[PDB]
């Protein structure tokens, strides 16, 4: 309860303290324990191949220069004291843009311990790149990682470990992605060697499974309905040249518009997606239907009923093969 | 292991140190070695004629004022010590917007050496302008460069060189552009003379080859299908005036929509691209097909079969000439 005594203790700790030197400089590497409390994953972008992550990033390490005696309490100091203390140069290797929230003050926590242990917490919103394999899109499964590494200190000066083992990362259940579900998360610790030296690495990875519900309503169902619409021409008499030709034209044009719109919502990848294959297949059926009437019109100047039993049967077989392959 | 001894050594180095003066001020120019470890090339924009580059920029130079003895170690100091040290005024000449990542601290590394050598590393995300020749688009090849130059110090005060020769730039294989492939990269060192004086220059250039896979599915294939769709009118009887006229109208209108959409995704260049030539050629065929029926309708109040053998033959010849010219 003696604020002056606490003030003297803290001033003694910071007297002669050199922020430029890591703890145990020139000696054994300092072990830094890390925990992450995930707040939310706001966005997952296929076009930019990145995701936005908000989390509470906490670092644990012991600095004997900050050890104090006579106070059986954990000193929770103002966040502005972190500028006078050494902190690990932790950075995210795969991030594209990140910041620390600063309202109403910087989202930062410093909590000292009698033995010299320092707890350093930060609330960070980060946009991390995540390369995606869209070959099976929209029935694909993605593995997005978050790489944690020291920038300047090599393994000879600093070491990273997940504090608490597999329980180091919490809040995974808080992730509520409308388009994805968190199948699994993993924690990986390893050493990465560059030209400048070997650096510690912590990796946090999520396996995301895309939800097919949106794409059934948005793309798959409209494509099927247009294909069924083309089948109406078979029951229309052949003398109705204007009617059957108009039916063939509009179904083909509508199919093209759907195909063009979908590809504009995704990155300009050179390979063919699963959804593209379905749209190409649907375009073939409607195009064949218009060609079917042209053949009927040509011979006229039994075929229709024969065509009535082939296209729905073939389209059902095409759907069965397509869904079994991608599920 | 004597932190106090190291603290005294570093304090001695910075005592009387003048950041305003370059090493060997008034004498021989200081040689600065540079290496780049490319992290990723996030975006390549044709509309803005620029690309986004993330890299680890490292500078090597010797400052005898920072030489220390008695410590057989490389001092990896906190990144905040860089504010008390002289650093080269390196800037990127062709960049449009750049920043240094600062989470959880500034992505900066300072590593001293006993002989006075200083290693200065920065993780920089930069948007560099790259003029593009879109005459052969989308079958074009682009050469995007990254110019590195000193802003204030001339060649009499500073010199640049690629540390490691042709191996100075690494991580080129990490570049994963969905639309481009890295054919080759080159390193160029030269001197550039301005009014204020002659300045050292380092240039890093990439040759990018665009992938045609996306454009075949998005633009080329839909255009061909519409052109084939116009050929259906030939097999339809001439008395079906509504049917054949509707076929000609819709194919022409669809061709215009595709042409308009493509040009909106590219900068308003005044010259004609390769893809524009193909769209213009496809528009001619569909327009001629509608004119063909008008001639048939006019004479009526053999031509169709004669037209059946000309347009597919001419269109195949047009495609053969087009692809051979641009490949």
């Amino acid at each position: 309860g003696n604020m002056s005594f606490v003030k003297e203790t803290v001033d003694k700790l910071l007297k002669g303290y050199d922020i430029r030197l890591r703890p145990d400089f020139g000696g054994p590497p300092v072990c830094v324990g890390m925990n992450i409390d995930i707040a939310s994953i706001d966005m997952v972008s296929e076009v930019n191949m990145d995701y936005t992550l908000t989390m509470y990033f906490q670092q644990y390490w012991r600095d004997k220069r900050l050890a104090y005696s006579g106070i059986p309490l954990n000193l929770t100091l103002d966040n502005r004291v972190a500028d006078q203390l050494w902190v690990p140069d932790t950075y995210f290797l795969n991030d594209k843009k990140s910041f620390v929230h600063g309202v109403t003050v910087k989202n930062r926590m410093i909590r000292l311990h009698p033995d010299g242990t320092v707890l350093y917490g930060l609330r960070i919103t980060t946009t991390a790149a995540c390369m995606m394999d869209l070959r099976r899109y929209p029935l694909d499964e993605q593995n997005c990682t978050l790489e944690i590494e020291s920038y300047g200190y090599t393994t000879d000066d600093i070491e990273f470990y997940w504090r608490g083992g597999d329980k180091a990362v919490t809040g995974v259940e808080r992730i509520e992605l409308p388009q994805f579900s968190i199948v699994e998360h993993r924690l990986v610790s390893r050493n990465v060697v560059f030209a400048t030296g070997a650096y510690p690495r912590l990796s946090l990875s999520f396996r995301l499974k895309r939800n097919i519900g949106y794409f059934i309503l948005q793309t798959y169902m409209p494509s099927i309905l247009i294909t069924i619409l083309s089948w109406v021409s078979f029951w229309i008499n052949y003398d109705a040249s204007a009617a059957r030709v108009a039916l063939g034209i509009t179904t083909v044009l509508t199919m093209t518009t759907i195909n063009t719109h979908l590809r504009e919502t995704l990155p300009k990848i050179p390979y063919v997606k699963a959804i593209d294959m379905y749209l190409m297949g649907c375009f073939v059926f409607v195009f064949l239907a218009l060609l079917e009437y042209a053949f009927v019109n040509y011979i006229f100047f039994a075929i229709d009923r024969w065509s009535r039993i082939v296209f729905p049967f073939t389209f059902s077989l095409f759907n069965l093969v397509y869904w079994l392959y991608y599920v | 292991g004597n932190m106090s001894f190291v603290k005294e050594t570093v304090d001695k180095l910075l005592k009387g140190y003048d950041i305003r003066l370059r090493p060997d001020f008034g004498g021989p120019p200081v040689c600065v070695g540079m290496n780049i470890d490319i992290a990723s090339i996030d975006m390549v924009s044709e509309v803005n004629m620029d690309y986004t580059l993330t890299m680890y920029f490292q500078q090597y130079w010797r400052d005898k004022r920072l030489a220390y003895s008695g410590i057989p170690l490389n001092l990896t100091l906190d990144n905040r010590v860089a504010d008390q040290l002289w650093v080269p005024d390196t800037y990127f000449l062709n960049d449009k917007k750049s920043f240094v990542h600062g989470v959880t601290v500034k992505n900066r590394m300072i590593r001293l050496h006993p002989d006075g050598t200083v290693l200065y590393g920065l993780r920089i995300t930069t948007t560099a302008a790259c003029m593009m020749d879109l005459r052969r688009y989308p079958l074009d090849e682009q050469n995007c460069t990254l110019e590195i130059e000193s802003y204030g110090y001339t060649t009499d005060d500073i010199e640049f060189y690629w540390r490691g020769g042709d191996k100075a730039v690494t991580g080129v294989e990490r570049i994963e552009l969905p639309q481009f492939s890295i054919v080759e990269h080159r390193l160029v060192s030269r001197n550039v003379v301005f009014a204020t004086g002659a300045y050292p220059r380092l240039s890093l250039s990439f040759r990018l080859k665009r992938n045609i896979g996306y454009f075949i599915l998005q633009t080329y294939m839909p255009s061909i299908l519409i052109t084939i769709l116009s050929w259906v009118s030939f097999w339809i009887n001439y008395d079906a005036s509504a049917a054949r006229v509707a076929l000609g109208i819709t194919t022409v209108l669809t061709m215009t929509t595709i042409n308009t959409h493509l040009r909106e995704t590219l900068p308003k260049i005044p010259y004609v691209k390769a893809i524009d030539m193909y769209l213009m050629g496809c528009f001619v065929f569909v327009f001629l097909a509608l004119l063909e029926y008008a001639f048939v309708n006019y004479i009526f109040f053999a031509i169709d079969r004669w037209s059946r053998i000309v347009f597919p033959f001419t269109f195949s010849l047009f495609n053969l000439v087009y692809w051979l010219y641009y490949v």
Partner: nanobody
Amino acid sequence: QVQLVESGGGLVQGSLRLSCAASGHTFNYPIMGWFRQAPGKEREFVGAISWSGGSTSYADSVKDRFTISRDNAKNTVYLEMNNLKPEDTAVYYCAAKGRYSGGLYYPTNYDYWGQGTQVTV
């Protein structure tokens, strides 16, 4: 999870073409590397190539002599060893590297390795 099998070694006195077939989650490991280990000497980097784009790198010793290329249809990476020398007597391995696993020249950055073929000239 990537499985690597390499073949095409043997003993010669010439041009030789090694090969390495990959299977599994190759998307997460877009970089394939070639390494050789002389008896007693540390494992040496030979060359690396990306699955997509065909970007390649080589060591100075094997520069302008060895060529590396891959075909994605067979998921195979092949090392063409031409103008062989007696110094090129080592066990040749095939390895795959993660996207953010670091530099190419360091074998410890690679996760999955092949069996290794012994080549003696």
